[PDB]
Symmetry: D2
Subunit: 396 residues, 4 copies
């Protein structure tokens, strides 16, 4: 992007702005364009554009000046060729799939997945006769195996994973896949372009739910995919059809958020780590999950490919369903709700939060224990948080 800029933070701030905006203004910030369409001065021009001789979005669903900024911004961060922005991560992933995976095609994905993302694959994709294989994030064998058994079109997974933050050796996987012509799409939502550059690692496509960290204010939804033009475009097209365009105001909000991405991520990364150990050492804490700890299975991989470990920490409390609840109920700072990555801390009991619809047995089918607890450390002051968590345990 720029030469005088080298740190991500500086980028996340001026990427796609400091230099130019294609919207010319003596204003420091990016202006919010609220238009439903774009006009032409004269037919001759309209022809030029349609003949690919001029530049324009044509329709709001085909783009927006305020948006392209955020688009380019992210692109620079992830260090990609191009980026696309949906109305929400779900949209992103969802589309991307229907976009790249052909009919009757096959796809590979890890067991640990985002509840919703799971369903789509287990209920929608089959309609298009698209079959998929579920393997463990670590089980490289299975991947290599399946890679040979069937003709995989694309391997899709997020790393860190959810809710056990299991990580995948991108570099390695990308290799094994690219060997068989498969595509590698990683959902580094939990990671953040700052904590890892899946693309540089070899991945083909990387996508995040800006709804979480990128926006980090819990006041907007948005999804995004970044990667080589040749690929991303293909999606953009289908996107223009499914029409899941992201509103400018939303885009701005995100751009504004990314102004302090590094600052936040940094703080979150810390609080997470420290609290993690503190939690791991705590007696009432049965188990704790966090790539930062050595106790974590892929910890070594985490170190080898990440420079941080996010601000999300999962852990099982030494108690039962009711008891665990009593714990969260004790907390006074974090909000009890889904989502994560915002300035405000959040906690939840997956078992209930998003798996209560299942049976105590089927729940275990995924490792979701009435014990497990997810904690998205906000940006509040460590001590204030720690104290809260601790005091919260002294209630059982």
């Amino acid at each position: 992007y720029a030469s005088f800029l080298n740190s991500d933070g500086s980028v996340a701030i001026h990427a796609g702005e400091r230099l130019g905006r294609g919207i010319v203004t003596d204003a420091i910030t990016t202006p919010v364009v609220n238009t439903s369409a774009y006009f032409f001065n004269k037919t001759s021009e309209l022809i030029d554009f349609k003949e690919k001789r001029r530049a324009s979005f044509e329709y709001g669903r085909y783009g927006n000046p305020t948006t392209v900024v955020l688009e380019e911004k992210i692109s620079a961060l992830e260090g990609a060729e191009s980026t696309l922005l949906m109305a929400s991560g779900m949209c992103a992933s969802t589309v991307m799939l229907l976009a790249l995976v052909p009919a009757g095609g096959h796809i590979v994905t890890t067991t640990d997945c985002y509840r919703k993302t799971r369903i789509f694959i287990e209920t929608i994709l089959p309609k298009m006769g698209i079959t998929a294989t579920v393997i463990d994030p670590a089980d490289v064998g299975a991947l290599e195996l399946a890679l040979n058994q069937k003709k995989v079109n694309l391997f899709f997974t997020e790393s860190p994973t959810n809710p056990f933050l299991r990580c995948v050796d991108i570099e390695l996987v990308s290799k094994l896949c690219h060997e068989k012509g498969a595509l590698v799409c990683i959902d580094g939502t939990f990671a953040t372009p700052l904590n890892q550059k899946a693309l540089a690692l070899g991945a083909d496509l990387v996508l995040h739910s800006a709804t979480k960290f990128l926006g980090g204010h819990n006041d907007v939804l948005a999804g995004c995919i970044s990667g080589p033009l040749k690929l991303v475009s293909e999606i953009r097209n289908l996107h223009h059809i499914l029409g899941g365009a992201l509103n400018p105001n939303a885009a701005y909000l995100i751009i504004r958020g990314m102004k302090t991405l590094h600052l936040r991520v940094q703080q979150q990364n810390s609080t997470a780590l420290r609290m993690a150990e503190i939690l791991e050492a705590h007696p009432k804490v049965r188990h704790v999950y966090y790539p930062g700890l050595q106790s974590h299975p892929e910890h070594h991989i985490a170190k080898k490919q990440m420079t941080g470990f996010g601000g999300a920490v999962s852990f099982e409390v030494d108690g039962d369903l009711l008891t665990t609840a009593k714990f969260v109920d004790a907390l006074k700072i974090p909000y009890i709700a889904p989502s994560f990555g915002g300035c405000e801390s959040i906690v939840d009991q997956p078992a209930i939060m998003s798996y209560w619809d299942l049976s105590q047995s089927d729940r275990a089918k995924y490792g979701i224990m009435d014990n497990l607890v997810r904690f998205s450390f906000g940006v509040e002051d460590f001590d204030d948080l720690k104290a809260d968590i601790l005091q919260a345990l002294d209630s059982i």
Copy 2:
């Protein structure tokens, strides 16, 4: 909704507000809630909600207080059981399809369709093995015929149609379809809930591109579908997965726009008509399409089911591609761009605007002549507009 509010206008203004908002405030307008998620006071409550004992959107993608208002508002207008709001009409229709039409199923639709909507049906649905039949809007025979030949899941079409505003005898069609268990979905975009109540006519589902008239300010994209709960919900579900949620700010803008829906539509309906005749009578005007005129094929139907004829008028100029262009180029008030229904007037040459990608021959395959011109009369003053149009004709 209310017992003291009968006129649609009054409704479009206070529907889902005047009484209550479920967001309690001494404010006149609906408050814009910019949240990515919703929290719970205590686990006990989260359980209640999950157990369907409490009310909450859970996640921003599953709803929003600012949105439900607009949702209820529209619901009242169309006099439906419930309404859903997407990020754009395209999304709406696109989803609604994948939602109701099963795999390998069959769907019937008219020849005159929105370019994009067409493609989706001709390139995506086939993937799910979904076959469809294209018939003329008037050709009731074909419908009844196909209604028997194959097993139609749903008949989808807009009325007025585009760009020839061909209308469909809803009532009749609804009957013929419901007789064979097929579903009838009408895209009353061009119409507007004020000019026609497709639902009352018998239709099962009605959807508009709020991007156009509902918003009527050319500053926001949004789609919406309304109808019986039992049905709309099924879609809402799939919606929650594809994640094409509409941003609050957008929702508000629309709510703000509908405050003057009637006012606008009225003005637009008139200007259209008058200008239509005036245009029809003009020597340089070869042909003019508008349900308001008798010259219109389904004019009788238009009168029987409509109370207005929108503010959109299409017509062929007595000239050639280049000449016609010279005409639009002469206009000084309307903007040359797609979209329509906004306060500002808009014009375009379909042949170029959205079919230039096709051959002179293939173009005619749909009646799209280098002659045809679409005119979305804005809300500007009649005389001002008429004078402009006329002056732009002598040029030829």
Copy 3:
């Protein structure tokens, strides 16, 4: 503004937009610029601007692209040289005063004034030793008299007046004033640039509280002053100091509202009149105030300078404090609150709404009877409204 546009409405729509925006974009609507300041490419340029060789706002308090639009727009409507936009009408009038009236200066104003505006004059201006004389809106003699007795710096008043919508023969007054070198500033809030052009009538400065009609959505506050550059600028300066700048988002909302100004005003003007008569004819209605009726004192003047009579109507109910309340309490459509001019109808009992702080006696000092009722007819359907009003008159 432009040649082809001659109807106020068309102007309120394309004024300062259709042609150019100085913010260049292929967008239909005006982009919202959210910046706190403006930069320069190089010192040489900064010098140029500072030396008045380049164009720029310099600081957000010194202007904004998104705002200048609304600025010019209004300017066109009122057919003025230049317009200024404050954060609220109050700011406007308030500033304008301290801006034009010198220390120890004198000013003339009518008895019927906006509560607040009054106080400022009766409590702040005195601090600067500024004395003022209060006269009856009609009593031209007093004005002419005072015009001679002391040396008036400026005659300030609003027409129609509040809450008796008393009007002032601008043209005449302007004459008498300009003869003695005095300045005439009219607050045509209740009027609207569409119902009258005080400027053309001879007035020096006209100002409205965009909070009411211009925005007419009851979702934003804003004031504006329009008139000759030589004058307006002098205010703008002091403005740049007191720093009461209007936020861009607000500006936009207004610009968006004015898109349907005419449409609204029209509807409002009608409903008002009709209802007015109907009300006047009603038995339980003791008296009715509206320039549209002949019963109105300055009705002739109203006809001579106005083309409409607003959508505001005041009237005394045949009852006592408690009874009158019971009436408003019966209404089901209008909201009980201050303000007015929005799509939503509003009602209030001045005696209480903004005079309850005064004694039953002191109240009468201004004609404010526990009887009087102000009714800002919204944009709802007439029948719906009338029916409501009537039905509430049977409860007494």
Copy 4:
């Protein structure tokens, strides 16, 4: 505010939210209420409110739910009784003055002031016969002296000062003044409630231009005053008249900005210091101003009352007008413009930026040398900035 919240950071995040909002919502963020007024359910209620038995804003100019949050938020940080929010700092200071200083009264203020603030005092206040005395920030004698000579009504000054960041020993001054019944109002804009609590130091009123740090995104204007109720309210009253209300959307943006106040300030404080020293040590750098350095006059006081030194740094370059310019022109990261405190870095040459209107001579009357350069360090990465600055020097 809240027990479990001690670190300011945590407060700036949950102050006036985490607990309650008086706007009840299961939403994480504060909803943006866009209303111009507030209604009442029935007259009886209206009476109650007017009789001070109920709670309501009555009019939008009299408050707003979305605003009060930010109000309470700041209140908590500054640890005050109450806070008020204007449309801009200028508005704040401006109003505050006319609000507290009586007619013919006297006020004391330091020489180093905000250009605009200066004029207001030197051109407007005199109208109200308000005389003022200018003294050096450090010269305690003068203050004490003047404190006795005349009857001071209030001592107003900002610390750090501009553009030399001179600081004032609040505690001391507050003492000297309170001894003579004078009021102490400090403009800790440059400081930030995080780097100092003037209120705790004894000051009576503290105010900042949220336009700068509080918002820290260079995309919104707003001013705010905080202090004892008995005092602030007196201002709020006059404010309700002058009507300089802050728009909700503005308020929100700030609220959203403060979510990462600490995070930012922290980063800024560091970059500033480091760079300062590095600058001071640089040969081409004649002088450097920063309370963090020992070279600074009031450095000791800075240490005794501050915990930070802001992210603003002033310094004189070893060159002449033209040369200095050549320097800023070399910089590639910071934007050349007024304002400061935003994520983006800013630079300027006061001599030109806001004093070019004066003579080379009159300029020195305030120390403004064609040498001096102001640098508002953004939040970009240190190395990136440093590298830029340095490189911008070897260019001489």
